Design a protein around this nucleic acid. Structure first.
Ligand SMILES: [Zn+2]
Ligand SMILES: [Zn+2]
Ligand SMILES: [Zn+2]
Length: 84
DNA sequence: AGCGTGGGACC
DNA sequence: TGGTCCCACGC
C-alpha cells in the first residue's frame, strides 16, 4: 500500500488516497459533519447519513423473504441469514 | 435489534 | 478533495 499514516507508531498503510485522509481524522479527532437534528458530530458523511435515519425512522432496505425493512444495508444483510 | 465506527473500493 | 456504497467488528 502506497499511502502510510505518519502518526507515530501507527503502521497503517492504505491504497486509496481518500481512505488515508479519512483514517487521519481518527488521530486528529476532526469531525467535519454535524447532524441538524441532535447536533452531534461525526467523522464521516456516510455515517452521518445513516445516523439521521435513527431520527426519521427511514428504512430503505427490505428483506427479500419477509419484507422487513432496515435503515442500513448491512443490517438487512445480517437479518436475511435468519431465514436459513 | 440498533448503531457507532473503521476498512476496501469507488466516483 | 468530498463524498458514497458495501461490509465487517464491536457491545
Ligand atoms: Zn494512523
Ligand atoms: Zn442526530
Ligand atoms: Zn426477513
Amino acid at each position: 500500500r502506497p499511502y502510510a499514516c505518519p502518526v507515530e507508531s501507527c503502521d497503517r498503510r492504505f491504497s486509496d488516497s481518500s481512505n488515508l485522509t479519512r483514517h487521519i481524522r481518527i488521530h486528529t479527532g476532526q469531525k467535519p459533519f454535524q447532524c441538524r437534528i441532535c447536533m452531534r458530530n461525526f467523522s464521516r458523511s456516510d455515517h452521518l447519513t445513516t445516523h439521521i435515519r435513527t431520527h426519521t425512522g427511514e428504512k430503505p432496505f427490505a428483506c427479500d423473504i419477509c419484507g422487513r425493512k432496515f435503515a442500513r444495508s448491512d443490517e438487512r444483510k445480517r437479518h436475511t441469514k435468519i431465514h436459513l
